[PDB]
């Protein structure tokens, strides 16, 4: 369930597709917060026209190593 | 019933030795010796660590404190249903029988035992420490 | 040595004697309860103060009390 | 006004802080497009900031030298200068909800204490009884005052255990 | 904790860094060999110096980390 | 079904549902009424 | 016939008792001259997990 | 065999383990627990101990005077007390290298010295000391006084000089002599010194033992005192242009009540202090004639206590029997004395920073900070001791039969209500103070500082306005120009006091805001929680539901075993033990608040504190991280400076604190088993088994472990904060 959640977050609330075209400048992000009580500030400018929390789990690099290029596969 | 006498020439259980045995206290202060009778050869656990084999018949062992002897007594009584007994030996050679003191185990009442350290009152009836103050030394109200 | 005291609220259940790990307590005849027995402490010089007897006592409040007193080789449970 | 403070509608530091917040939000927005999700989210945050500042100034809050609103806890000053909405009305609101919760819980404990196994009802909550008591707890101040006046709110000293002193 | 502290300081001091013209500039400037031999060096150059990013993170996207940094002390 | 409802009536499940309801109510109030500081 | 009736509720008057000023059910009363003939059972256990105790005739009151 | 040490305990002397030495050292002053101790012998031993303590105090004072006179710069500091740092003593350490030698060589000395932070320079300068000869003479005099006190202590133990038990119980005579002689006459003598030496020395006139009999303190010479024209002593005071130590701008008055501070020294007027001591001397002397001793007139404290019971019976028997339970219990008297002394120590700290009495003390920021922190920590420790002795009184000296129905018995009658209400107050304060802090932290983190809750302290600001501060604008009492209270003091002391309180450059009633409100609530939480632990431990000292016979085990015992659910830390000693941590936390909060507010004040930016004290991140970054930069840079790979000793002390305190956590977390059993393995290793090692121990090695007891862990915790706490405070305040200024 946890792994499926990681793949779902990388497929619907991430910037993996944009990060593929520029992995040296775009920060990996796979978590977005809802705009409530002023917490939207946590959705930082990670690059690629995306706003979210910079993840450090390394799922982007693992997916790139496996040959995943689209959100449909995730 | 009569008080038994320690037999120093009694075979000991088969044990290869350990580092949890006797120390200088046995040679300078005192030590304890436990003896028991076994119906057959059986492997038991030593209170100081390890597994020993008690032989058929008399068995003698030495320990540094009385708690080790009573722990072995409890193990032999509850598991193998034996009746062990121990003594306190001094470096001069004096032997003092310890348990069972009157030949009967203390858990069961036996005639001839005189009660000691018994207060004919309850805890709530104890006096305050102020009435015990300025005594010979630190005394609790329960001691009177 | 520690001070072990028995009180008259004892019911003679012999649970404190069975729980003593150094043979300090025993049972003596008595007439103040149904069991006709009472706990006793005739070997307090060997008491270490573990208070297992107090843990095994079912009366409220306890019928056996252990007050930590002077410390010696036996009371400290030293094998050296 | 009170304690040498000035109203937030006239404080220069208040407007300066509003301009600073809008400036950093606009600076972050300058790096995105004009019809994208981050642009819409940043614009929504900017509108929320403007509305919050206007609402705080409209409420009549007092701002200090730092430009931040300051609350008045004294009932006399709050009722004399129109600051009862800061600390007075929320005080009574919390008292009502807190006493509501406490009264409902006390009623549930008293109700399940007369059963066969009250502890079982304490671990496994009786939902119908709890819901009925939760709905009936709206009149907790009146019921509490009546219980206090009848002498049934407290327990006698002889029925409460104490230490041997 | 001492293991991860050593890893972080060693990587930021002698491995990680940017590449410039005829030279490599590290994150901390190679101060591990000169300051990791004293407890004062670990407290000042590693704990006091590197904690600046988490204490002044308020008002940005990493502010949450700062909040947790305080919550974890609690 | 009776046993399932009794299980749902236990303290952790009831606490979870109640706290989810209370948190949702507070979140929705703060969503429709953003930044409430004074009455 | 001495002591409280079996099955009745009494209040403990022993100060050092855990159930002091608490109500307990009477189980049995000894007919001999023992110090504590009344046997009282309680619904709440003490710190030792015990729910019964022995009390004297003057240590319990019908409450 | 039986050892000689300890001679006061036969049971401890028969102990064959290392516990004998530790317990003999920790039970040396517990005279009530000694073998064959009586009441008369107890009082005699306490009398001798008191004399020895006075001897130590006087010797310590003489040592400070001698070192300042020998290795200090007092003769140069009096010339320029604004730009010259005081010198404590010289440094002679063979471990110092060359850079450390030139680093500590400062302050005009010829070698490495220590810059004093105790403030004895300002105090001695204000009271009249000018040269090193004066300090040398004072040091010799105090050494002689110390030797005399030590001889008195030895003499009162020999036969024909031991006081009887009845002499020690003469409460009326002792109280009369302490109020009239120890307090009133001493204050009158201090007034004589201020009028005769301090005041003329502050006006450039030298008055010493060689000419004080030929120099008049006032030009009218005792005539106005005898004729009743006392107002003649307040005529012609020091003007606003008076230079301390010189005759320029000096006056002739000796007893004034101008109020406020001196325009140059920023301290209280010497004439005002002299007049203060004279008034309190008269009051204390008059109060010293209240009790009946040997002339029929006076009171009997037993009669006043017995005749003070309310008629409705709200207080039961009232104070009947309270005279005997206090006079016959030394722990009750010790607890009362420690409670009053702790409160007075706190009062000293507050009044000393707000109203500086010594010349050029407010400019010395390090001295002010160190003095305030020192007195507050001393006060906290003394308060904890007062409550601990109250618990000891309940266990060892309280008699329910003698105190039947009085207020003392009624306190234990409703102790559950007191503990429960203390718990409720502490819970409310903690929940709300922490909630407001976390809310402000979240608002500052999300970039919305206008959304944090900032409650203005209108009550304290209202009090400040009542004292004369017109910043808030309340305009009432001393703040209003048309009030009776204002007009009645405009000719005596209100001008100077108003000018000083309306000045924002001093510490006299500093401006407060929401940050002050929040930290004051944190202080209230600390006080209430420490009080809850101490009060609960004193009331439950005689027993509880878990241990109905706790009084039969003494004040300090390990536990009651793992039975009945577990009884760890059940004694009253353990309650005091847990309360010491809360006391350290409370004093830490008050000293943190004091240091940060004063640091921002001295730096000229109070807005920094006003805007960063409302959230905990501001406290951690703008106060702890920002002010420790110079401290941790005392020694670095590029060299070192004079501030390296504070950096070493900082790390030293951290190490001691962490070492305390070991005795605090790990318990006896593990260590005892480890020690047994070590015993076997030593007994089975050749060339080493020939050397045997005299005491059997055993692990530290549970109570000893708690005491050792708390001692390390407190030592590390104190040393760490002292090093940080002194280094930050001295380096910044
Ligand atoms: C500058 C001045 C000081 C200088 C110090 C210099 C060097 C350091 C010296 C010594 C170091 C510590 C040595 C003792 C360690 C503890 C050993 C101990 O025996 O420990 C146990 C002792 C002894 O307890 C007694 O133990 C007794 C043991 O009796 C037993 O044994 C008896 C004798 O046989 C009897 O038989 C008796 O029946 C039996 O029960 C009893 O139980 C008593 O009731 C009980 O009180 O307890 C105690 O704690 C007694 C101590 C009370 C301390 C109270 C204050 C605590 C303050 C803490 C915070 C400190 C902060 C420092 C700040 C610094 C900032 C810079
Ligand atoms: C296993 C790890 C995991 C974690 C840690 C998260 C975490 C998160 N998810 Mg995600 N997700 C996961 C797996 C995970 N997900 C998987 C496997 C899927 C595919 C099905 C998804 C699909 C998904 C979607 C579509 C969305 C999220 C969203 C979110 C975020 C909003 C939190 C939320 O739930 O709001 C809602 C909170 C509640 C509904 C409250 C629930 C409380 C209930 C009532 C408790 C009941 C207790 C009961 C006994 C247990 C339930 C059992 C029941 C299901 C039978 C959050 C950070 C949202 C988001 O990212 O926002 C942009 C979003 O829209 N997730
Ligand atoms: C929790 C403690 C607390 C504290 C520390 C204060 C403190 C204060 N209150 Mg107060 N108050 C409290 C609780 C408290 N109140 C509660 C629970 C109530 C509800 C009953 C009130 C209702 C109240 C009123 C209606 C007023 C104050 C006022 C005041 C201020 C001055 C009066 C005073 O000191 O006497 C203590 C307060 C009282 C005994 C309440 C009665 C008010 C007295 C009689 C003074 C009023 C006369 C006049 C207005 C004084 C100002 C003169 C001039 C400057 C206008 C003062 C700072 C006065 C004020 O400054 O108005 C802005 C004011 O009129 N309070
Ligand atoms: C029926 C619920 C209930 C009620 C009416 C009370 C009432 C009271 N408590 Mg208490 N408490 C409770 C539950 C409750 N508590 C629980 C569950 C705990 C364990 C966390 C505590 C722990 C506690 C402590 C440590 C203290 C009090 C104290 C007090 C008194 C001071 C007021 C206060 O709010 O303190 C604060 C109370 C709390 C912070 C805990 C409240 C917990 C929630 C809000 C209660 C909800 C219970 C339940 C889930 C709801 C009923 C469900 C039912 C319908 C099925 C007061 C009479 C103080 C005291 O001794 O009196 C002077 C005090 O020191 N309480
Ligand atoms: C006890 C401490 C405490 C207090 C007094 C407050 C108080 C407040 N907080 Mg805060 N907060 C706290 C702790 C605290 N917080 C902590 C510990 C955190 C970290 C988790 C936060 C994090 C936090 C955030 C992120 C936010 C707040 C916000 C708020 C404000 C919202 C008011 C509201 O909910 O609308 C009104 C609520 C109701 C009308 C509910 C009424 C209940 C029923 C339905 C009606 C019955 C009444 C009769 C309010 C003034 C919000 C804000 O805007 O700040 C100004 C917000 O953004 N808080
Ligand atoms: C006028 C006669 C007189 C005088 C002067 C004294 C004086 C003293 N007696 Mg004594 N006594 C007397 C009569 C007298 N007694 C009589 C008649 C009896 C028999 C009934 C006793 C029975 C007696 C006993 C049993 C004891 C004493 C003790 C003491 C000493 C207390 C030690 C102390 O606390 O320091 C001095 C205290 C002060 C100077 C008061 C300080 C005022 C506050 C607390 C401080 C504020 C001052 C100021 C702000 C701080 C200065 C600032 C700066 C200088 C640092 C003290 C020197 C104790 C002792 O023996 O010690 C050896 C003691 O045990 N007396
Ligand atoms: C006028 C002040 C005063 C006086 C006369 C007493 C007198 C007494 N106290 Mg008491 N107490 C006081 C204040 C005072 N106390 C204060 C301020 C506290 C709070 C700290 C306490 C807390 C306290 C407790 C908890 C207990 C006593 C006990 C006792 C009694 C005997 C214990 C004893 O002293 O043996 C000797 C004392 C010691 C050997 C102290 C050990 C050394 C300490 C920890 C200092 C360590 C500092 C460290 C070395 C610093 C090094 C740093 C450097 C190397 C870097 C005795 C009658 C005990 C008692 O009544 O017995 C039942 C008891 O348990 N006191
Ligand atoms: C930062 C450390 C810390 C904290 C927070 C506390 C907190 C507290 N101590 Mg304590 N103490 C400490 C260290 C600490 N102590 C240490 C080192 C010692 C020495 C051993 C002591 C010794 C001590 C004693 C002896 C006593 C206390 C008492 C108390 C309570 C005082 C009442 C209060 O202020 O209410 C406020 C409550 C809090 C501050 C708790 C925090 C509330 C949290 C943050 C809210 C819940 C978070 C969220 C909603 C849910 C998260 C859970 C998650 C798993 C889902 C309080 C809970 C006294 C007491 O019990 O009072 C009755 C008491 O007698 N303390
Ligand atoms: C910083 C605090 C601190 C310190 C200094 C120690 C130190 C020690 N711990 Mg320990 N521990 C701590 C915290 C600490 N612990 C805490 C908080 C816990 C609770 C979780 C534990 C739990 C714990 C356990 C369970 C064990 C230890 C053990 C040990 C010992 C390991 C042997 C060793 O390191 O050799 C050398 C000693 C040191 C490095 C300590 C510093 C010595 C300095 C550098 C030397 C100074 C000498 C100097 C010249 C002295 C002159 C003084 C002068 C006045 C004369 C050692 C003495 C283990 C042990 O028993 O030993 C095998 C063990 O089993 N600790
Ligand atoms: C346990 C115990 C005890 C106790 C202790 C204690 C008690 C502590 C505490 C505490 C404290 C520490 C206290 C204190 C206090 C204080 C008070 C009570 C006060 C006050 C006040 C007033 C009255 C004031 C007034 C005024 C003002 C307001 C300002 C201006 C001036 C005037 C004067 C006007 C003892 C030992 C005895 C013994 C027994 C046991
Ligand atoms: S456990 Fe208690 S009741 Fe039972 S025999 Fe021992 S002392 Fe008596
Ligand atoms: Ca002179």
Tab-separated table of C-alpha atoms in Angstrom, chain B:
chain	number	residue	atom	x	y	z
B	1	UNK	CA	14.731	-35.517	63.765
B	2	UNK	CA	18.372	-34.550	64.323
B	3	UNK	CA	20.580	-31.882	62.730
B	4	UNK	CA	22.612	-33.416	59.871
B	5	UNK	CA	26.389	-33.243	59.640
B	6	UNK	CA	28.257	-32.127	56.532
B	7	UNK	CA	30.199	-34.845	54.696
B	8	UNK	CA	33.119	-33.170	52.876
B	9	UNK	CA	33.819	-36.415	50.970
B	10	UNK	CA	30.627	-36.220	48.930
B	11	UNK	CA	30.641	-36.431	45.105
B	12	UNK	CA	29.809	-33.247	43.203
B	13	UNK	CA	27.707	-33.004	40.012
B	14	UNK	CA	29.435	-33.339	36.647
B	15	UNK	CA	30.367	-29.774	35.671
B	16	UNK	CA	33.156	-28.505	33.443
B	17	UNK	CA	33.679	-25.334	35.459
B	18	UNK	CA	32.788	-21.682	35.006
B	19	UNK	CA	33.918	-18.164	35.861
B	20	UNK	CA	30.927	-17.517	38.134
B	21	UNK	CA	32.128	-19.733	40.981
B	22	UNK	CA	33.750	-18.973	44.319
B	23	UNK	CA	35.991	-15.966	44.945
B	24	UNK	CA	38.357	-14.802	47.720
B	25	UNK	CA	35.360	-14.461	50.077
B	26	UNK	CA	35.153	-18.258	50.332
B	27	UNK	CA	38.767	-18.441	51.514
B	28	UNK	CA	38.637	-15.408	53.822
B	29	UNK	CA	35.057	-14.915	55.070
B	30	UNK	CA	32.684	-17.889	54.434
B	31	UNK	CA	30.981	-19.947	51.730
B	32	UNK	CA	27.960	-22.231	51.436
B	33	UNK	CA	27.605	-25.941	50.686
B	34	UNK	CA	24.391	-27.538	49.387
B	35	UNK	CA	23.777	-31.298	49.439
B	36	UNK	CA	20.907	-33.329	48.033
B	37	UNK	CA	19.911	-36.826	46.944
B	38	UNK	CA	19.010	-37.568	43.324
B	39	UNK	CA	17.053	-40.607	42.170
B	40	UNK	CA	18.790	-40.588	38.768
B	41	UNK	CA	21.367	-38.745	36.690
B	42	UNK	CA	19.785	-35.548	35.406
B	43	UNK	CA	20.882	-32.307	33.754
B	44	UNK	CA	20.023	-29.171	35.740
B	45	UNK	CA	20.923	-25.491	35.437
B	46	UNK	CA	23.599	-24.051	37.702
B	47	UNK	CA	22.643	-20.799	39.492
B	48	UNK	CA	26.061	-19.374	38.560
B	49	UNK	CA	25.551	-20.128	34.856
B	50	UNK	CA	25.763	-23.314	32.806
B	51	UNK	CA	24.303	-26.809	32.813
B	52	UNK	CA	25.539	-29.520	35.182
B	53	UNK	CA	24.632	-33.187	35.582
B	54	UNK	CA	23.553	-34.378	39.015
B	55	UNK	CA	24.608	-37.955	39.707
B	56	UNK	CA	22.546	-40.754	41.195
B	57	UNK	CA	22.788	-40.457	44.964
B	58	UNK	CA	24.469	-37.760	47.055
B	59	UNK	CA	25.399	-34.444	45.435
B	60	UNK	CA	27.445	-31.604	46.952
B	61	UNK	CA	28.011	-28.088	45.604
B	62	UNK	CA	29.615	-24.849	46.792
B	63	UNK	CA	28.267	-21.317	46.375
B	64	UNK	CA	29.353	-17.840	47.393
B	65	UNK	CA	26.081	-16.709	48.958
B	66	UNK	CA	22.976	-18.204	50.556
B	67	UNK	CA	20.723	-16.913	47.757
B	68	UNK	CA	22.435	-19.195	45.225
B	69	UNK	CA	21.891	-22.207	47.489
B	70	UNK	CA	18.220	-21.359	48.005
B	71	UNK	CA	17.732	-20.762	44.267
B	72	UNK	CA	19.156	-24.209	43.548
B	73	UNK	CA	16.960	-25.628	46.329
B	74	UNK	CA	13.861	-24.068	44.752
B	75	UNK	CA	14.820	-25.432	41.329
B	76	UNK	CA	15.428	-28.955	42.660
B	77	UNK	CA	12.217	-28.954	44.716
B	78	UNK	CA	9.891	-27.549	42.044
B	79	UNK	CA	11.281	-29.453	39.039
B	80	UNK	CA	12.799	-32.763	40.182
B	81	UNK	CA	10.814	-32.954	43.481
B	82	UNK	CA	13.933	-33.410	45.616
B	83	UNK	CA	14.767	-32.393	49.201
B	84	UNK	CA	18.057	-30.438	49.354
B	85	UNK	CA	19.695	-28.927	52.438
B	86	UNK	CA	22.573	-26.424	52.893
B	87	UNK	CA	25.161	-25.228	55.372
B	88	UNK	CA	27.404	-22.226	55.908
B	89	UNK	CA	31.095	-23.152	56.109
B	90	UNK	CA	33.758	-20.890	57.639
B	91	UNK	CA	37.494	-21.003	56.778
B	92	UNK	CA	38.301	-22.456	60.210
B	93	UNK	CA	36.180	-25.512	59.358
B	94	UNK	CA	33.013	-24.656	61.286
B	95	UNK	CA	29.786	-25.880	59.679
B	96	UNK	CA	26.386	-24.333	60.436
B	97	UNK	CA	23.159	-25.967	59.242
B	98	UNK	CA	20.859	-23.397	57.632
B	99	UNK	CA	17.846	-24.743	55.715
B	100	UNK	CA	15.478	-26.344	56.584
B	101	UNK	CA	16.474	-25.041	60.050
B	102	UNK	CA	14.096	-27.299	62.009
B	103	UNK	CA	14.043	-30.149	59.477
B	104	UNK	CA	10.681	-29.002	58.087
B	105	UNK	CA	10.362	-26.461	55.287
B	106	UNK	CA	9.289	-22.991	56.518
B	107	UNK	CA	6.281	-22.754	54.169
B	108	UNK	CA	4.464	-25.339	56.311
B	109	UNK	CA	3.885	-24.718	60.016
B	110	UNK	CA	5.810	-26.965	62.410
B	111	UNK	CA	5.550	-27.333	66.176
B	112	UNK	CA	8.319	-25.930	68.354
B	113	UNK	CA	8.920	-22.772	66.314
B	114	UNK	CA	8.964	-19.614	68.443
B	115	UNK	CA	7.689	-16.503	66.699
B	116	UNK	CA	10.200	-13.698	66.215
B	117	UNK	CA	9.780	-10.045	65.156
B	118	UNK	CA	5.990	-10.178	65.527
B	119	UNK	CA	4.078	-7.004	66.393
B	120	UNK	CA	0.748	-7.543	68.181
B	121	UNK	CA	-0.814	-4.554	66.412
B	122	UNK	CA	-1.396	-3.344	62.872
B	123	UNK	CA	0.555	-0.842	60.784
B	124	UNK	CA	-1.934	1.982	61.387
B	125	UNK	CA	-1.371	1.655	65.141
B	126	UNK	CA	2.327	2.566	64.869
B	127	UNK	CA	3.371	5.701	66.758
B	128	UNK	CA	4.768	8.823	65.123
B	129	UNK	CA	8.546	9.234	64.614
B	130	UNK	CA	8.610	12.167	67.076
B	131	UNK	CA	8.010	9.701	69.923
B	132	UNK	CA	11.026	7.686	68.712
B	133	UNK	CA	13.304	10.712	68.183
B	134	UNK	CA	16.529	11.214	70.185
B	135	UNK	CA	17.017	7.483	70.685
B	136	UNK	CA	20.306	5.581	70.602
B	137	UNK	CA	20.404	5.687	66.791
B	138	UNK	CA	18.086	5.897	63.765
B	139	UNK	CA	15.028	3.976	64.945
B	140	UNK	CA	11.743	3.460	63.145
B	141	UNK	CA	8.431	3.386	65.068
B	142	UNK	CA	7.935	-0.246	64.008
B	143	UNK	CA	11.018	-1.344	65.975
B	144	UNK	CA	9.289	-0.596	69.295
